[PDB]
Amino acid sequence: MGKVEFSGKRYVIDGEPVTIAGGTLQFFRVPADAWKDRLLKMREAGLNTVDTYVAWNWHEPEKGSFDFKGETHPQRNLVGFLELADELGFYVIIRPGPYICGEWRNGGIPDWLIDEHPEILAKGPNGPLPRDIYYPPITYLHPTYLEAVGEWYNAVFPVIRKYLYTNGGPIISVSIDDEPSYWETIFQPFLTDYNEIITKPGGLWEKWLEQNYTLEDLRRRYKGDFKDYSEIKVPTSFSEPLPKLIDWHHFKLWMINEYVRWIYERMAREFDVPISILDPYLLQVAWRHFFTYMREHNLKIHVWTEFWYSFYRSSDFKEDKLGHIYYKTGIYRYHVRKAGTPPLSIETQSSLAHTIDPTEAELLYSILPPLGIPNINYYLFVGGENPEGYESHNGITWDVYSPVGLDGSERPHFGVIKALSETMTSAEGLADAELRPKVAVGLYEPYEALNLWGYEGLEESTDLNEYLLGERGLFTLLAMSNTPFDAVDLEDVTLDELLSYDQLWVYSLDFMSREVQDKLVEFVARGGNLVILPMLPRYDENLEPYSSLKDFLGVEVEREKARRNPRLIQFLSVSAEGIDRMLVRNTVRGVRGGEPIAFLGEKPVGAFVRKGGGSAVVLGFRLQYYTSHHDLHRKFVWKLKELQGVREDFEVTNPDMIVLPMEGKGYAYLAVTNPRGHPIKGRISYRGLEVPVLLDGIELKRRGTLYLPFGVRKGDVEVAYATATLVMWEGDVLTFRNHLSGHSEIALKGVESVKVSGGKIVDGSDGEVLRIVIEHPGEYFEVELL
């Protein structure tokens, strides 16, 4: 019967592509007598999909007693919820754990398991962890754990199976665990896991060492005199060799990988819909290890992501967050496009901030499609409450500003979700259209680890949160400079992939593998344009001296140590052509050789070198997002792009108008956004076409986003452009939305006349085109083709 398939960027249900617009309704945390009303409110919001966990400890409250029908509590009626969601026309994404996070007791793991079998608990290097901590960590690969999970799955899997879309029910995907990260302990490298199955002679650590390295390799890599693998003790402090620390991290990722494989093999045998997972490891760059392991073991897993930015404070989704969002969507889509599964955000923050400003929510949600993710689930969409004994992180409450309250109230971001869902499910060709940046950023996994840890040994700081990702990060600068970027894994990426970009930015610390340094050399030599900062690498992956990149480039970068104490971090000024005293923070390194292009006083601190038809810019400083009237940071980006020949497909008159062109075959949708949120006006050019023509500019009165059609066609009729979002085109009626100003300009080919409702034509022109300006007193208006 029913079919759930996938192609390109979408799931395909019974042979029709569908864009997922989902809300999370955790049935087990919402009164059963309210489920139907709340699903009707999701219908009203334009959602086609419902996401829910299934919690082990909820449905098996005592060992051996399973309740999926509401026999012991009406909120244990999984069966009834799945039947109701189906009757009401929803797809279901189901997430049966065992771990479900969810701010729920033990993340779904039963106390009766942990209390009876404390030997499964993960341990610290000096003994047990405390027991009153949230989500008690567990040693994944302990057989007693796995056996118990298997018994959970044996109960719940037959219910899932019966209700799969392929069997006449609603369920379209089953997810593995929940963002498995060692129970949110991977961030702290010596908190976990020292369980004896790991650390004993012949234990998992020793076996993993033996599978990955020769003993001699480890003697050289860790600078040790080992006579047997059993002599290489688990690390317990930052005084141990950095290579060994990196290995300990990757060992943990390996154990998570084995756990995920174990679950996958059970799910794959039982279910013929897509098997999914959310944010493996709670890392991003380290996904390289996940996708490689999937390929190695033929695991057909659909990896999904999430976007969370504010917890237990008001929302804070403004221009500051763009760097991080661009980075995360970038590295996500790099891997998922190569796996061939649809990009999807299974958790898109809609709760857990105390007050969610609708314009900030709009910015977050609406930037996901141009950044490659058109399939979006809002979490938590339906507010709830925690049954007694199942509280964890919020006490009784599970309604922290959800779009629909526990009482059925509608909060302001409900209407944001509704408007964007209508567009995403209805606008022809939008989901399939793709941003195609001219620029890439090169990410390097080991640095993610170091940032996670706050590692301090090196010449350069590991505060990549500050210099790359955050409110002043380089990535935020690139976004706000109107420089869209792909993100690539520097170890995995091919030369041909790199050379597909006009400019590659690489942030370097002291060390960089031989394989990556040599690759960058080849990139440049073959015509690539590099920007590298704030130093060149001096060491390889083993911390042994190695500098092929630097030697090829023919410059020299002074040695200087970056500072960590905020009071001691310098405030310095760098000048360049057309750039008088641009602020830079922290230690600045002289760059000798090549053509000097930036200066700290009379000292060169950035240089340009050409090699064949390629080039490199080497900066001895951290370039960050700062803005002002003078706006030198943005200007410097633009000067580097001009130096290396980078030309975007679009131009703007107002630098605060951020444009992301979503290109399809013969058409595009330009996402046009105002992240700063102050009123802005300007013109845009796309591939040489300047818009608007009759209006003085596109006006965006506040923070928000438009998806402007360029070349969207049906038959012989084309929307050459519009300054309003084309929400849908049904028969001969075009529905447009412009919630950011009171007028819109539309340019049409192939039609002689129109009738407008919800507004008045106040201006127009041509033979070439039917151009009209419509004043509309609301957000929505319709143009009927005659």
List binding-site positions for substrate: 53, 102-103, 178-179, 306, 347, 379
Candidates 10, 252, 333, 411; binder of its own copies (CB under 8 A) is 411
Is 385 a binder of ligand GCS (CB under 6 A)? no
Annotated catalytic residue 179? yes
Is 586 a binder of its own copies (CB under 8 A)? no
Please give the residues from 457 up to 486 whose contact with its own copies meets the rule CB under 8 A: 471-472
Q: What is the residue whose two structure tokens read 């990196």?
A: 246
Q: State the Cα–Cα distance between residues 596 and 605, nearest whole angstrom.
A: 8
Is 385 a binder of its own copies (CB under 8 A)? yes
Is 412 a binder of its own copies (CB under 8 A)? yes
The Cα-based distances of 471 to 199, 326, 590, 638, 676 in angstroms read 41, 12, 26, 20, 12
Q: State the Cα–Cα distance between residues 476 and 467, nearest whole angstrom.
A: 10
Is 101 a binder of ligand GCS (CB under 6 A)? yes
Q: State the Cα–Cα distance between residues 178 and 596, nearest whole angstrom.
A: 50
Cis peptide before 128 (omega within 30 of 0): no
Q: State the Cα–Cα distance between residues 662 and 671, nearest whole angstrom.
A: 7
Candidates 191, 260, 562, 640; binder of its own copies (CB under 8 A) is 191
Locate all alpha helices (DSSP H) within 554-631, ordered by sequence. none
The stretch among 41-49, 101-109, 472-480, 498-506 that binds ligand GCS (CB under 6 A) is 101-109
DSSP per residue over 236-277, as a string?
Answer: -STTS-HHHHHHHHHHHHHHHHHHHHHHHHHHHHH--S-EEE
b/e for 529-558, b at 16 or more Cβ within 10 A? Answer: bbbbbbbbbbbbbbbeebbbbbebbebbbe
Which of its own copies, ligand GCS, none has residue 306 at its interface (CB below 5 to 8 Å by kind)? ligand GCS
Q: Minimum Å distance from CB 176 to ligand GCS? A: 12
User: Which stretch of DSSP H or E encloses residue 753?
Assistant: none
Q: Which of 260, 72, 75 lies closest to 149 in space, CA to CA?
A: 260
The stretch among 15-23, 96-104, 422-430, 502-510 that binds ligand GCS (CB under 6 A) is 96-104
Candidates 60, 178, 448, 486; binder of ligand GCS (CB under 6 A) is 178
Q: Which is nearer to ligand GCS, 347 or 360 (CB)?
A: 347
Candidates 92, 148, 171, 352; binder of ligand GCS (CB under 6 A) is 352
The stretch among 30-38, 374-382, 523-531, 581-589 that binds its own copies (CB under 8 A) is 581-589
Q: What is the chain's percent helix, strand, coil content, to nearest 5? A: 30, 25, 40
Is 570 a binder of its own copies (CB under 8 A)? yes
408 and 37 Cβ atoms separated by less than 8 Å:
yes
The region that residue 8 occupies, defined by phi over 0 for left and psi between -120 and 50 for alpha, beta otherwise, is left
Contacts with 275 (C-beta within 8 Å, 6 or more apart), sequence order: 173, 174, 175, 176, 264, 267, 268, 300, 301, 302
Is 318 a binder of its own copies (CB under 8 A)? yes
Contacts with 449 (C-beta within 8 Å, 6 or more apart), sequence order: 245, 246, 249, 286, 455
Is 399 a binder of ligand GCS (CB under 6 A)? no
521 and 614 Cβ atoms separated by less than 8 Å:
no
Q: What is the CA 481 to chain-centroid distance, rounded?
A: 20
Is 308 a binder of ligand GCS (CB under 6 A)? yes
Q: Which is nearer to its own copies, 352 or 506 (CB)?
A: 352
Is 711 a binder of ligand GCS (CB under 6 A)? no
Q: Which is nearer to its own copies, 288 or 739 (CB)?
A: 739
Which of its own copies, ligand GCS, none has residue 178 at its interface (CB below 5 to 8 Å by kind)? ligand GCS
Task: Supply the Cα-derived Rg of the chain in whole angstroms.
Answer: 27
Which of its own copies, ligand GCS, none has residue 388 at its interface (CB below 5 to 8 Å by kind)? its own copies
Note the maximum CA span of the chain.
87
Which of ligand GCS, its own copies, none has residue 610 at its interface (CB below 5 to 8 Å by kind)? none
Which of its own copies, ligand GCS, none has residue 412 at its interface (CB below 5 to 8 Å by kind)? its own copies
The stretch among 24-32, 91-99, 627-635, 767-775 that binds its own copies (CB under 8 A) is 627-635
Q: Which is nearer to ligand GCS, 179 or 445 (CB)?
A: 179
Residue count at the site for ligand GCS (CB under 6 A)? 10
Q: Which is nearer to its own copies, 21 or 584 (CB)?
A: 584
404 and 4 Cβ atoms separated by less than 8 Å:
no
428 and 734 Cβ atoms separated by less than 8 Å:
no
Which of its own copies, ligand GCS, none has residue 718 at its interface (CB below 5 to 8 Å by kind)? none
Please give the residues from 288 up to 307 whose contact with ligand GCS meets the rule CB under 6 A: 306
Give me the catalytic one of 179, 360, 699, 745. 179
Please give the residues from 468 up to 497 whose contact with ligand GCS meets the rule CB under 6 A: none
Token digits of residue 475: 């990535």
Give me the catalytic one of 60, 319, 347, 466. 347
Footprint of ligand GCS on this chain (CB under 6 A)? 101-103, 178-179, 278, 306, 308, 347, 352
Footprint of its own copies on this chain (CB under 8 A)? 129-130, 132-134, 184-185, 187-188, 191, 312-314, 316, 318-320, 354-355, 357, 383, 385-386, 388, 391-397, 399-401, 405-407, 411-412, 471-472, 565, 567-568, 570-574, 580-584, 626-630, 632, 676-679
Give the active site residues: 179, 347
